[PDB]
Amino acid sequence: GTHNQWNKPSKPKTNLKHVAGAAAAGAVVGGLGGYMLGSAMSRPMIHFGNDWEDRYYRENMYRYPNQVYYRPVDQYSNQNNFVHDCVNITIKQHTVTTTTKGENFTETDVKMMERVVEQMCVTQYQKESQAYYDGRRS
Amino acid sequence: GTHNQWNKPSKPKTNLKHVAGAAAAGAVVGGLGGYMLGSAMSRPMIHFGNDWEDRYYRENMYRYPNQVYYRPVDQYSNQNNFVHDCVNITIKQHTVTTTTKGENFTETDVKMMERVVEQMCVTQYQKESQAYYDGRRS
Amino acid sequence: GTHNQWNKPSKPKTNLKHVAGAAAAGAVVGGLGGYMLGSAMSRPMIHFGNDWEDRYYRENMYRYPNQVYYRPVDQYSNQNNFVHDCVNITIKQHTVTTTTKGENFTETDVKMMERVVEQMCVTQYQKESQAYYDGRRS
Amino acid sequence: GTHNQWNKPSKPKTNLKHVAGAAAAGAVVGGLGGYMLGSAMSRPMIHFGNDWEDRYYRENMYRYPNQVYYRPVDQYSNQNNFVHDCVNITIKQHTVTTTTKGENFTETDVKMMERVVEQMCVTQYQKESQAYYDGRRS
Amino acid sequence: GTHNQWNKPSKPKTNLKHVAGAAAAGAVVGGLGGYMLGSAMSRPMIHFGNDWEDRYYRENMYRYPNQVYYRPVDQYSNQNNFVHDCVNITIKQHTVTTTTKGENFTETDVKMMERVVEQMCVTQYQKESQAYYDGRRS
């Protein structure tokens, strides 16, 4: 048989920025086995040219067995937490004066602050706290 | 047989920005096995050219067995929490004066603050707290 | 047989921004096995060219068995919580004066604050709290 | 046989922004196994070109068995909660003066605040609280 | 048989910026086995030229068995936390004067601050806290 193939693409612009199987960009993972993933496959396909295939054996007998288990026998956790952001906290004493004229002016200003804030974005503290765990085996 | 293939694409612009199997971008995962995923497959396909296939054997016998179990035997958790944002907190004492004329002016201002805030965005604290856990086995 | 294929696409603009199997972008996962997913497959298909197939064997014998179990034997949880946002909290003392004329003016202002707020966005605290858990086995 | 295929698309603009199997974007998942999903498949198809198929065997014997179980044997939960937003809380003392003329003016203002707010967006706290759980086995 | 192949692409611009199997860029991983991943494969394919294949044996007998287990026997955790950001905290005493004219002006300003903030972005501290764990075996 006679087979003829012709292809003259003009200015082929192909763009592929981010390709991943298990992409974790700018991510924060917690403690005590926070993230558990078995498998992740990503295979994009782009075809532009001529494809000629015949009487082939492409793919057979594919298996994807995955087991993700979370079995702690004796797990003890007293305090568990996480905080992402504590942003834009300010204590300000602002005064603006734009006097343009006057006579015998007496501008007296008094500004006082006493014990404004005691706690701010405070996490996971114990004061005079007692924890008892008597794990005995025989 | 005679087979002829012709393709002349003009300015083919293809764009593929984000492709992933299990994408976790800018994500926060909690504790104690928060996220559990078995499998994740993503395969987009784009075809533009000529495709000629015949009497083939593409794919057979595909299995996707997944088991995700969460079986803690003895799990003890006293305090568990998480806070995402604590934003835009301010305590302000603002004064603006724009006097343009006057005579014998006596502008007296008094501003006082006493114990404004005691707690702010405070999480997961114990004061004089007792926890008892007597785990004994025989 | 004679087979002829012709395709001349003009300015093919294809856009694919976000494709994923199990996409978790900007997501927060809770504790104690919050998120449980077996499998997730996504395969979009786009065809533009000529397709010629004959007497093939594409796909057979596909199985997708998934088991997601949540079986904690002895789970103890005293306090469990999570807060997303605590935004736009302010305590302000604002004064604006725009006097343009006067005579023997006596502007006296008094502003006082005493114990404004005690608690603000406070979560998961125990004071003088006793927890008893006597787990004994024989 | 004779087979002829012709296709000349003009400016094909195809847009695909968000495609996922199990999409969880900007979602918060609760504790104690909040989210449980077996499987999720999404495969959109778009066809524009010529398709010629004959006497094929596309797909057979498809099974999708899914089991999602929630069987905690001994689950103990004292306090469980979650709060999404606590937004736009303000305590303000605002005064505006726009006097344009006067004579022997005596503007005296007094503003006092005493114990305005004790609790604000406070969640899941125990004071002098006793919890008893005597789990004994033989 | 006679086989003829012709391809004259004009200005082929191909771009591939980020391709990875398990991409973790700018990510922070937590303690106690935070991130657990079995496998991740990503193989994008781009075709532009002429492809001629016949009576081949491409791929068979593929298996992807993955097991991810989290089985701590005796796990003890007292305090577990992590904080991402503590940004834009300021305490300011700002005064602006733009007087343009006056006569016998007496501008007296008093600004005082006493014990403004005690705690700020303070995490995971114990004061006078006692922890008891009697793990004995026989």
Author numbering:
A (entry chain C), B (entry chain A), C (entry chain 1), D (entry chain B), E (entry chain D): 93 to 230
Paper text:
Here we report that with methodological improvements we have now obtained cryo-EM data for aRML fibrils with sufficient resolution (3.0 Å) to determine a detailed structure of the amyloid core. The resolved aRML structure comprises residues 93–230. Residues 95–104 near the N-terminus of the aRML core sequence are held tightly against residues 140–144 by an interdigitation of alternate sidechains across the interface. As in 263K, in aRML a β-arch of residues ~103–140 extends from the N-terminal steric zipper residues and has an anvil-like head that we previously, and unaptly, described as a “Greek key”. A staggered interface between the head of the N β-arch and the C-terminal half of the core has the sidechains of residues 120–124 of a given monomer interacting with sidechains of residues 169–176 of the both the same monomer and the one below it.
Nonetheless, the similarity of our anchorless RML structure to one reported for wildtype RML prion fibrils in an accompanying paper indicates that these post-translational modifications do not substantially alter the amyloid core conformation.
